[PDB]
Amino acid sequence: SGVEGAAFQSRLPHDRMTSQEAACFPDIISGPQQTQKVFLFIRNRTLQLWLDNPKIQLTFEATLQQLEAPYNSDTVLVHRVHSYLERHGLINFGIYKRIKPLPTKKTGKVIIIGSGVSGLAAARQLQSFGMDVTLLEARDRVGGRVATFRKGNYVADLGAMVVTGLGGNPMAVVSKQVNMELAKIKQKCPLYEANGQAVPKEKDEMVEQEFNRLLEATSYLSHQLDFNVLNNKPVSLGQALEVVIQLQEKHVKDEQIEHWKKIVKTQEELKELLNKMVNLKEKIKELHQQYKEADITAEFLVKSKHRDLTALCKEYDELAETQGKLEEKLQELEANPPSDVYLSSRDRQILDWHFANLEFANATPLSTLSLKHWDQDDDFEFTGSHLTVRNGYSCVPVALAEGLDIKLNTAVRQVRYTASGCEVIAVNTRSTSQTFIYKCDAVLCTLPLGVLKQQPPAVQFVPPLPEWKTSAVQRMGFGNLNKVVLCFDRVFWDPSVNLFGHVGSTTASRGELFLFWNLYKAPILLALVAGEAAGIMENISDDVIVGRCLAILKGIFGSSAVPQPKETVVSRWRADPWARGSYSYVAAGSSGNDYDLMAQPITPGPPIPRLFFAGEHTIRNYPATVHGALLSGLREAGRIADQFLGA
Ligand SMILES: [C]C1=C([C])[C]=C2C(=[C]1)N([C][C]([O])[C]([O])[C]([O])[C]OP([O])(=O)OP([O])(=O)O[C][C]1O[C](N3[C]=NC4=C3N=[C]N=C4[N])[C]([O])[C]1[O])C1=NC(=O)[N]C(=O)C1=N2[C]([C][C]=O)C1=C(O[C]C2=[C]C(F)=N[C]=[C]2)C(F)=[C]C(F)=[C]1
Numbered sequence: 001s002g003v004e005g006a007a008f009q010s011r012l013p014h015d016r017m018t019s020q021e022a023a024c025f026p027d028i029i030s031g032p033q034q035t036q037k038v039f040l041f042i043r044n045r046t047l048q049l050w051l052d053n054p055k056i057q058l059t060f061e062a063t064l065q066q067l068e069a070p071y072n073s074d075t076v077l078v079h080r081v082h083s084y085l086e087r088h089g090l091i092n093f094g095i096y097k098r099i100k101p102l103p104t105k106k107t108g109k110v111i112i113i114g115s116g117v118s119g120l121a122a123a124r125q126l127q128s129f130g131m132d133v134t135l136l137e138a139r140d141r142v143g144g145r146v147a148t149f150r151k152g153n154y155v156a157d158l159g160a161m162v163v164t165g166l167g168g169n170p171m172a173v174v175s176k177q178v179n180m181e182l183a184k185i186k187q188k189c190p191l192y193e194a195n196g197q198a199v200p201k202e203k204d205e206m207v208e209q210e211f212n213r214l215l216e217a218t219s220y221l222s223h224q225l226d227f228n229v230l231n232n233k234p235v236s237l238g239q240a241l242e243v244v245i246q247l248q249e250k251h252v253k254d255e256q257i258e259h260w261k262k263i264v265k266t267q268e269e270l271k272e273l274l275n276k277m278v279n280l281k282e283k284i285k286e287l288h289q290q291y292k293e294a295d296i297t298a299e300f301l302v303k304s305k306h307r308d309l310t311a312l313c314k315e316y317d318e319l320a321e322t323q324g325k326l327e328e329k330l331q332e333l334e335a336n337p338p339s340d341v342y343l344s345s346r347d348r349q350i351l352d353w354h355f356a357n358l359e360f361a362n363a364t365p366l367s368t369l370s371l372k373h374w375d376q377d378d379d380f381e382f383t384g385s386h387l388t389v390r391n392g393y394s395c396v397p398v399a400l401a402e403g404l405d406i407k408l409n410t411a412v413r414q415v416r417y418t419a420s421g422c423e424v425i426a427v428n429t430r431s432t433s434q435t436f437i438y439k440c441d442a443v444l445c446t447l448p449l450g451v452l453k454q455q456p457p458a459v460q461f462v463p464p465l466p467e468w469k470t471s472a473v474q475r476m477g478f479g480n481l482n483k484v485v486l487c488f489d490r491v492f493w494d495p496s497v498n499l500f501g502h503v504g505s506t507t508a509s510r511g512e513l514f515l516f517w518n519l520y521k522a523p524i525l526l527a528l529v530a531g532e533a534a535g536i537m538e539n540i541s542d543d544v545i546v547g548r549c550l551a552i553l554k555g556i557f558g559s560s561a562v563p564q565p566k567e568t569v570v571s572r573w574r575a576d577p578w579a580r581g582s583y584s585y586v587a588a589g590s591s592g593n594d595y596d597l598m599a600q601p602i603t604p605g606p607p608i609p610r611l612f613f614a615g616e617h618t619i620r621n622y623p624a625t626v627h628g629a630l631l632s633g634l635r636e637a638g639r640i641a642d643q644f645l646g647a
């Protein structure tokens with residue numbers, strides 16, 4: 001349906017109130033059921049009005065005007081609902097034409113550290129709410145881990161790059177607002193072995209299905225058998241994977257042993273049977289000789305010796321009957337061995353390609369992921385096909401930057417917060433002698449987890465953060481992932497495929513240049529560096545790693561088909577001091593609960609909160625994504641406005 005779709009698109013149950021709404025509307029949950037049903041229709045229709053046209057502000061007045069009778073009659077309730085939705089960023093979020101110009105007199109000073117999607121999203125909210133917002137950003141550009149390279153006619157994303165499904169995705173709104181050109185990804189992804197030979201279809205399918213089987217087995221191990229702690233240590237996904245492969249190898253070795261035992265036993269029966277047939281041939285040779293040597297007892301001696309000869313001959317024909325039914329069992333046993341090994345060497349390399357794919361998705365070696373919780377956010381996937389941004393994902397944060405007070409090249413070094421307000425201290429990255437002091441009522445920290453983990457610290461907190469926050473920082477994973485961008489003057493790959501895989505020769509390096517990505521109709525190739533390779537490869541110069549790319553591609557398509565690239569780019573997210581990695585992951589011994597701890601604001605001791613946190617690492621249900629960063633910015637804007645302007 002139409003207004004039900006709007007609730008789904010807002011990640012809300014269309015037919016019941018959330019706990020959050022129950023808190024804000026206690027008179028509804030405790031009141032008659034009929035009024036609760038009225039509430040839900042107001043909410044859904046208001047969201048639809050916004051979502052049908054997110055390019056302009058949806059005001060209370062326009063909501064009231066577009067509600068049909070009787071709903072346009074309960075003005076107070078309509079306003080309450082509109083107000084709630086607006087405060088939580090469910091309407092009037094992103095970038096839109098304001099009908100009511102911004103209030104000229106402000107209320108509260110908020111410093112936002114970082115101009116990534118989370119910082120920008122919060123800034124636009126807080127500015128809409130009438131506050132004085134200033135973003136301090138260390139880079140010379142906005143977007144943070146959204147980073148688009150442009151040179152000549154080439155455009156390519158170095159950070160985030162995919163919109164996952166649009167159904168339920170707040171980025172769907174931003175797409176309409178900003179005019180992102182989205183393009184569906186074709187799912188076919190051919191694999192090539194390290195010699196450049198294509199992986200045959202059967203091997204591709206066999207290994208992939210086994211990969212799915214192994215992984216489902218780890219999840220059974222974890223969530224049915226409660227095999228989550230071992231020798232006082234939390235189990236990692238990599239560990240469980242090694243265990244389930246070891247058991248398959250054991251099983252293969254068993255069926256091989258059973259089969260060899262059947263072989264040996266049949267050989268032993270043949271040896272025995274032949275020895276017995278031998279002695280019966282000798283016995284018949286003796287009777288056949290005493291049969292030609294032949295009175296009345298003699299005329300009866302021949303009858304008896306023929307009865308004896310042909311009875312031994314019946315014994316012998318029956319034993320050669322068993323001889324045949326046995327060496328017929330032997331022949332098909334030698335012709336039907338069970339698998340010699342679990343995984344051929346080539347099979348293993350291909351399986352390591354799928355593991356690399358998973359290390360790409362989580363940005364970290366599998367041996368670091370929590371077995372129990374690494375995919376705790378699975379249940380929140382959006383519906384619809386994934387897409388890429390043909391005009392470059394930076395268009396989103398660049399559009400969000402319009403009109404904001406943003407100080408670039410301004411690196412926060414220290415954050416002071418007391419019960420009387422806050423001070424943020426920063427240096428000019430082009431002249432680190434120049435120092436700045438920003439007084440404010442509240443600080444929103446969107447510093448990446450990688451920056452928070454940095455030892456010695458990049459940013460100093462005064463007073464230091466509480467143990468519950470720092471130890472959550474300590475526990476959480478922050479992974480890495482890098483790209484080689486290859487710009488050519490001609491397209492030599494299969495234009496109808498967006499993806500193809502290079503199977504690494506060894507397990508340790510399975511993530512090196514394992515995936516080649518294709519951007520729609522454009523002579524660009526992205527090669528991914530995942531897993532253990534991602535951090536190590538940062539120590540390789542651009543020219544050498546490009547050379548390794550070209551060697552792979554020449555192996556796949558032919559040495560003369562691959563020209564020299566016109567432009568190249570290489571991400572080094574770990575070494576980037578403003579990222580110190582790519583995005584969080586649930587490390588073994590962490591859990592979704594640590595993301596909630598990350599989101600919790602700090603209050604100086606006996607009082608009201610001063611220091612707030614947003615960023616992809618603060619949102620339990622959508623971590624490590626652009627939309628999660630966005631949603632987290634909206635969440636904190638709501639929390640801060642609730643604090644400083646009232647619920
Ligand atoms: C890095 C990365 C990469 C490479 C990739 C990716 C990613 C990443 N992602 C994630 C995102 O991006 C995130 O989440 C966000 O971004 C976050 O945001 P925030 O939170 O806000 O943060 P930032 O941005 O960083 O911001 C912050 C700020 O701050 C600043 N600073 C620092 N320090 C300082 C400062 N200031 C001052 N002071 C001081 N001291 C900085 O600078 C900044 O600004 C993502 N996501 C999404 O959604 N998408 C995508 O795409 C992504 N990605 C990826 C990975 C994985 O896999 C993904 C994917 O894939 C896809 C692809 C890509 C490529 F490239 N190629 C191919 C393919 C998927 F599929 C999915 C997902 F989800 C993800």
